[PDB]
Amino acid sequence: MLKIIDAKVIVTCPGRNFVTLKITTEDGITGVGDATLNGRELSVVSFLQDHMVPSLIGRDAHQIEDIWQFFYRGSYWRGGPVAMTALAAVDMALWDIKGKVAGLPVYQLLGGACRTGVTVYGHANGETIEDTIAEAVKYKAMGYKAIRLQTGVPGLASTYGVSKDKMFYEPADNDLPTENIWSTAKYLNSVPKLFERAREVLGWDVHLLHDVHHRLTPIEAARLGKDLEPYRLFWLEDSVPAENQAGFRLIRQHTTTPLAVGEIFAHVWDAKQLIEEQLIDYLRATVLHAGGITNLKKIAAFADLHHVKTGCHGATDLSPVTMAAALHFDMSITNFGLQEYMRHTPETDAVFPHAYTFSDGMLHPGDKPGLGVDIDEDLAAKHPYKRAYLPVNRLEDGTMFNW
Amino acid sequence: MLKIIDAKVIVTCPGRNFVTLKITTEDGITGVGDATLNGRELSVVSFLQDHMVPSLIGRDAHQIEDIWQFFYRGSYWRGGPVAMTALAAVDMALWDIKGKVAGLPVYQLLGGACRTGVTVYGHANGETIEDTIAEAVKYKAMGYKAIRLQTGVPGLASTYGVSKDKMFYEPADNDLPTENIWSTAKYLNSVPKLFERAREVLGWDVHLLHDVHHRLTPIEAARLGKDLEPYRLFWLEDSVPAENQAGFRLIRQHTTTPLAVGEIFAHVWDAKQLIEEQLIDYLRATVLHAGGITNLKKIAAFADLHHVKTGCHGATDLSPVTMAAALHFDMSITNFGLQEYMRHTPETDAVFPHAYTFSDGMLHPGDKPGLGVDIDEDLAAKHPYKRAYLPVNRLEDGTMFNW
Ligand SMILES: [Cl-]
Ligand SMILES: [Cl-]
Ligand SMILES: [Mg+2]
Ligand SMILES: [Mg+2]
Ligand SMILES: [Mg+2]
Ligand SMILES: [Mg+2]
């Protein structure tokens, strides 16, 4: 029995906001879990500390699945990004604890190593095509096997994924949401040239990816996928908002460009139709926003029955605690596809010391017991919360749209 | 142009917790909206005051749909009970303001009166069948045209909906979740007798309802629905958890007992398959938990294409502000089915003075401009927040289950 004696929520902003749950057991074994929900951080803080945490106290930390079900079913209102992110933080901390008790890295509990390391993709961006390709050349030189390309839309002042930051992209940049303007036509007429040029310069062995970031309708995404077929993308991501899962049927009927979706998904139900009808090739859902290792492991098993591989999201708003958890998960499944890896700031790496390392285009979680990560509370305390929002996006006529 | 100059979240516990948003405009017109999420109340408080509210300041309150879209899309993570309940509060308050500007009750803006009043059901319960039926007789003498019946399960210490409270049921009763134990078989073998007896005593004109409260599988619910056909129930509610909406296909194939579901639903997507395959007869989703009048009006329109009527949830954890908004909505649609009405405490009614009245089995929202409800802030401040959780439920072997 590993009785839980304390559970605390820590908020810090070492370059951007992160929320972390730290659980302590009676004999001093601790675990951490990430609870960061970009642009709505404090709602999760409250969901944990005002509501979930009081029920953790006195529970046996060994009971991972029962605690998971207790919170998932016990909340009454079911799922949603706030609830599932809070649950993720508990789940990650409990797996961390399990590994420490077992004297083993978490991946050893989930099936053991299925690969030598975890292949990542990097984030090339620029205002013009030549700018983006110059960045991609850099990522290839740095040993990346896979690279996402995003580029400015001619005739629009701003677009998703293009900024002054080059090893990462940090869009939550203002204390009220930054407003953008969008034209779908300007984008559809321009973005295929990016991938034509990329293949001319970079060749055909490197994997190339693209995030549409929710801006198309299915018949538009069908067209974009066809236009991109000649360049053999690894995936085309989040092409259309996915609440209507049948929306992907039209895409799938018209293009063979592989499809990815799901960084925002909170539970299996957000992907069930997509997976069961073979409408996607990669599921982007994460241990952070879809309810932890416990839940993502179940989802991955279901995905593997339908040729779906994992392509976990990995933007900066997933802390090093999520990255550790994601790497243990990624190491231990047959149907791993790719792992996104945006670099954290040096201050973030200092606040969350961790065992995972990057070499030759792959991450590896290390072999420390548990997750192989912790939070330095003293350093965390030196970086207070700073309100910061994700941007919003409107059409040319002012219509509220999807960023 | 009606500039928003202030927006405050007020938390009060006049017999149970309620959260309320109050929006003030430049020239003094105010609106209120309910934001209460039973057992997770403080998470919505934070989602509103730490994240949404800062964007409300300076906006034109007339722009109801644009503000709705701004929050729904702008949060990035989409939907979920916390986000959609926060959004409902904003939406209710904006409609309140709109009615006030227009000098009309809200139902007059949504289509006008479609009926003389809003028919409700009440809440008969007791430990034995005789006790439950005597309660029903009381409600029938009070002029209720529809009555829900819940009764103790022989051989179980407790069950859903049975307590010492008789005009309402207030299950969030402890500062940690109260634990219950469940046997499906004991319930399936016993509950039809309640409705057999009810028809012998009450007759056939009164509408009789039952809330299964998430405790069956589809084939079990199919059986219960068949067993209850002789008694012609108005609806059989929440028979199975509904994340897998295709679960209702088996129930529908086997029984003609009418089905209701959805008090917990946060958005149209939670009901889309249920509605489009004609799997239910009544949608239970509310202006509070499914994103306001704006969203529920759209959902009701979709429902009406598939013979689905509204049966909004109306338990105590929906404040009088929700009930006002629910009644304006209920008055103004063709496909109204029934409105649930649990009584609030006298203290709750005093904190939330309201125009709506009850007579001859119907509620009517009144004819004041706006919603016809307000919050008395001075009185609200006399009743501080008190943590209180919904109960949890486990099977005989300890398995975490659905309450
Ligand atoms: Cl949620
Ligand atoms: Cl949510
Ligand atoms: Mg910076
Ligand atoms: Mg993305
Ligand atoms: Mg009481
Ligand atoms: Mg119910």
The CATH number covering residue B321 comes to: 3.20.20.120
Resolution in A: 1.5
What spatial distance separates the first Cα and last Cα of chain A, rounded to whole Å?
47
How far B81 CA sits from the closest chain A CA (Å)?
6
Helix axes A191-202, A218-228, angle to 10 degrees: 30
Question: Do A78 and B83 lie within an 8 Å CB cutoff?
Answer: no
Contact (CB, 8 A) for B364 and B328? no
Paired strand residues for B199 = none
Cβ(B14)–Cβ(B317) under 8 Å?
A: no
Q: Which residues of A touch B66 (CB under 8 A)?
A: 400
Q: How far is A266 from chain B (nearest CA, A)?
A: 9
- Binding residue per annotation — B340? yes
Could B77 and A45 be called an inter-chain contact, meaning their C-beta atoms sit closer than 8 Å? no
Q: Is the CB of B70 less than 8 angstroms away from the CB of A267?
A: no
B148: three-class secondary structure by DSSP: strand
Distance from CA of A203 to the nearest CA of B (A): 35
Residues B130 and B10 placed together within one structural domain of the fold:
no
Within 8 A of A402 by CB-CB distance, chain B residues are: 73
A1 and A36 part of one domain: yes
Q: Are residues A124 and A265 in the same domain?
A: yes
CA A218, CA A247: separation in Å to the nearest integer?
Answer: 6
Q: Tell me the two tokens of residue A312.
A: 């976990």
Token code pair at residue B277? 């395959």
CB B86 within 8 A of CB B35: yes
Are residues A188 and A328 both part of a single domain? Answer: yes
Q: Which residues of A touch B274 (CB under 8 A)?
A: none
Tell me which ligand sits closest to the C-alpha of residue B286. Answer: 6
Question: Which residues, 6+ apart, have CB-to-CB distance to B293 below 8 Å?
Answer: B91, B92, B95, B106, B110, B287, B325, B328, B329
B339 and B357 both lie in a single domain: yes
Closest ligand to the CA of A342: 4
**Rounded-to-integer distance, Cα A201 and Cα A218, Å:** 30
**Dist. CA A346–CA B226, nearest whole Å:** 64
Residue with tokens 């009927």: A253
C-alpha separations of B37 from B196, B261, B318 in Å: 36, 18, 8
Scan residues 125-154 of B and list those with Cβ closer than 8 Å to A: none
Of B286, B254, B251, B294, nearest to B270 (Cα)? B286
Closest CA to A287 of A35, A106, A12: A35
CA–CA distances in Å: residue A132 to residues A191, A241, A345, A383? 12, 26, 22, 33
Which residue of B lies nearest to A263 if distances are taken between CA atoms? B77
What percent of chain B is helix, strand and coil (3-state, nearest 5)?
A: 35, 20, 45
Distance CA A228, CA A257 (A): 7
Q: What is the residue type of B368?
A: K
B177 touches chain A (CB under 8 A): yes
For the beta carbon of residue A191, count every other beta carbon within 10 angstroms.
21
Q: What order do you get walking across the sheet with B30-34 strand by strand? A: B4-12, B18-25, B30-34
Nearest CA among A279, A285, A264, A276 for reference residue A303:
A276
Q: Using the CB atoms, write b or e for A342-373: b if 16+ within 10 Å.
A: bebeebbeebbebbbeeeebbbbbbebbbbbb
Any residues with CB less than 8 A from the CB of A380 and at least 6 apart, and which? A10, A12, A14, A20, A351
Q: Which is catalytic among the residues A213, A289, A328, A354?
A: A213
Rounded distance, CA A301 to CA B37, Å? 33
Q: Are strands B339-340 and B118-126 parallel, antiparallel or unpaired?
A: parallel
Strand partners, A20: A10, A34
Tell me the technique behind this structure.
Answer: X-ray
Nearest one of B16, B8, B122, B4 to B67, comparing CA atoms = B4
Instruction: Out of B62, B213, B254, B306, pick the active-site residue.
Output: B213
Question: Does the annotation flag A344 for ligand binding?
Answer: no
Please tell me the number of Cα atoms within 13 Å of A395 on its side-chain side: 10
Which residues in chain B have their CB less than 8 angstroms from residue A75's CB? 39-40
- Residue-wise burial string across A100-109, b where 16 or more C-beta atoms lie within 10 A, e elsewhere: bbeebbbbbb
Q: Which residues pair with B112 in a beta bridge?
A: none
Asked whether B242 and A79 are in contact (CB, 8 A), the reply is no
Regarding whether B153 and B76 lie in a shared domain, the answer is: no
Which amino acid would we find at residue B227? D
DSSP H/E element including B363: strand B362-364
Same domain, A55 and A203: no
* Residue B247 near residue B233, CB atoms below 8 Å: no
Query: How many secondary structure helices (H) and strands (E) does chain B include?
Result: 14, 16
Q: Kindly determine whether residue B81 and residue A77, on different chains, have CB atoms separated by under 8 Å.
A: yes
A288 touches B at CB < 8 Å: no
Among A87, A38, A18, A49, smallest CA distance to A290 is for A87
Q: Do A162 and A260 belong together in one domain? A: yes
* Residues 6+ away with beta carbon under 8 Å from A71: A52, A55, A83, A86, A87, A90
A357 and A229 in a common domain: yes
Q: Do B54 and A176 meet the contact criterion of CB atoms below 8 Å apart?
A: yes
Work out the number of other CB atoms within 10 angstroms of the CB of residue B400.
19
Q: Are residues B340 and B193 located together in one domain of the fold?
A: yes
d(CA B400, CA B293): 35
**Catalytic residue, candidates A107, A121, A144, A160:** A160
Q: Which amino acid is at B356?
A: Y
Give A208 Cα–ligand 5 centroid separation in angstroms: 62
Q: What is the CA(A83)–ligand 1 centre distance, in A?
A: 4
* Domain containing residue A100: CATH number: 3.30.390.10
Cβ neighbours of B87 in A, within 8 Å: none
Q: Does the distance separating the beta carbons of B269 and A37 come in below 8 Å?
A: no
What is d(CA A50, CA A29) in angstroms, rounded to the nearest whole number? 23
CA distance linking residue A22 with residue A10, whole number of Å:
8
What is the residue whose two structure tokens read 């409609």?
A: B95
CB contact under 8 A, B80 and A243: no
| Rounded alpha-carbon distances, angstroms, from residue A309 to A148, A165, A297, B256 | 18, 29, 12, 42
Spatial neighbors of B402 by CB under 8 A, at least 6 apart, are A73, B213, B214, B215, B241, B393
Tokens 């199919």 locate to B222
Whether chain A has a CB inside 8 Å of the CB on B192: the answer is: no
Do B279 and B358 fall into the same domain?
Answer: yes
- The encoded tokens of residue B161 equal 């909906």
Could you give the number of structural domains in chain B?
A: 2
At A178, give phi and psi (nearest 5°). Answer: -65, 135
Q: Looking at B121, B139, B144, B160, which residue is catalytic?
A: B160
Please check whether residue B251 touches A, CB under 8 A: no
CB A362 within 8 A of CB A118: yes
Dist. CA B398 → ligand 2 center (Å): 29
Residues A205 and A329 in one domain: yes
Helical ranges in B255-291 per DSSP H? 272-276
Distance CA B209, CA A151 (A): 58
Tokens in use for B388? 């209180």
DSSP B108: G
Q: How close is the Cα of B239 to the center of ligand 6, in Å?
A: 9
Tell me, what DSSP letter sits at residue B58?
T
CB neighbours of residue A278 within 10 Å: 12
Q: Is position B284 annotated in a ligand binding site? A: yes
A220 is in an annotated binding site: no
User: Is A364 assigned to a binding site?
Assistant: no
Report yes or no: A383 and A13 within 8 Å, Cβ to Cβ: yes
Per the CB < 8 A criterion, the answer to whether A45 and A11 are in contact is yes
A370: Cβ–Cβ under 8 A, 6 or more apart, which residues?
A31, A95, A96, A97, A98, A99, A100, A105, A106
Structure tokens at B67: 């503000």
- C-alpha span between B46 and A112 (Å, rounded): 40
Note if A213 is an active site residue.
yes
Q: Which residues does a chain break follow in chain B (C to N more than 2.5 Å)?
A: none
| Chain B neighbors of A81, CB-CB under 8 A | 77-80, 82-83
Query: H or E stretch including B346?
Result: helix B346-351
- Among candidate residues A173, A135, A166, the one with its CA nearest the CA of residue A317: A173
Phi-psi region of A284 (alpha: psi -120 to 50; beta: other; left: phi over 0): alpha
Q: Is A289 touching B (CB cutoff 8 A)?
A: yes
Return d(Cα A388, Cα B340) in angstroms, integer. 41
HSE-up (13 A, CA, CB side) for residue A311: 26
Out of A74, A78, A81, closest to residue B177 by CB:
A74
B184 is in which domain, residue-wise?
106-367
The answer to whether the annotation marks A211 as part of a ligand binding site is: yes
Active-site annotation holds for B187: no
Partner B, chain A 50-89, Cβ-Cβ below 8 Å:
50-51, 54-55, 66, 69-70, 73-84
3-class DSSP string for chain A: CCEEEEEEEEEECCCCCEEEEEEEECCCCEEEEECCCCCCHHHHHHHHHHHHHHHHCCCECCCHHHHHHHHHHHCCCCCCHHHHHHHHHHHHHHHHHHHHHHCCEHHHHCCCCCCCCEEEEEEEEECCHHHHHHHHHHHHHCCCCEEEEEECCCCCCCCCCCCCCCCCCCCCCECCCCEEEECHHHHHCCHHHHHHHHHHHHCCCCEEEEECCCCCCHHHHHHHHHHHHHHCCCEEECCCCCCCCCHHHHHHHHCCCCEEECCCCCCHHHCHHHHHCCCCCEECCCCCCCCHHHHHHHHHHHHHCCCCEEEECCCCCCCHHHHHHHHHHHHCCCCEEEEECCCCCHHHHHHCCECCEEECCEEECCCCCECCECCCHHHHCCCCCCCCECCEEEECCCCECCC
Buried b (16+ CB within 10 A) or exposed e, A290-327: bbbbbbbeebbeebeebebbbbbbbbbbbbbbbbbbbb
Ligand with the closest atom to the CA of A15: 3
